[PDB]
Amino acid sequence: AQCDFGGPFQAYKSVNGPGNGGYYLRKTTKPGTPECAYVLVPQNTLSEGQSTSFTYGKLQNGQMIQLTATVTVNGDKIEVTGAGQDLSGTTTVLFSDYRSCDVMRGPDGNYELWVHSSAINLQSYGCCDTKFAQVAGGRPIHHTWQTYCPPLP
Length: 153
Ligand SMILES: NCCc1c[nH]c2ccc(O)cc12
Prior knowledge:
CATH architecture: Beta Barrel
InterPro entries: Calycin, Tick_his-bd
Protein name: Lipocalin
Shape: globular
Order of helices and strands: HEEEEEHEEEHE
Keywords: Signal
CATH topology: Lipocalin
Bound molecules: serotonin
GO molecular function: amine binding
Organism: Argas monolakensis (Mono lake bird tick)
Number of domains: 1
């Protein structure tokens, strides 16, 4: 069935997602990103314009490390503060199904596919794959999640 890439797309709904678990950074056009990079959905429901803490991490020494930063949501903007030299800054939601996957423009201008822990082992990410392919174009793709990645904390 056809995908609908007309928005608008609402950041608080993207960041809340299915209402549980978290998202792995599955593919990106930015090189050098830490293997198994992920965010957890915030512990409490976000509504429009709010700021909240969230956990994020990556694989390190066989374990998923947890760090915290702040995320504030407005329109299609996910604004991250206090996450250092990777996740901090403005992420824009280009597409999302509010459930399993998102396609973003990251703060550096790169494109990103994020996939919910419930859907990460699927063979195809459906409409997000189609959207990520569109925006990524002929740019090199880096595959950040691998089947050896531990499960989310
Ligand atoms: N579901 C939104 C996944 C995601 C991508 N980039 C993010 C930055 C902060 C955040 O809480 C979440 C994200």
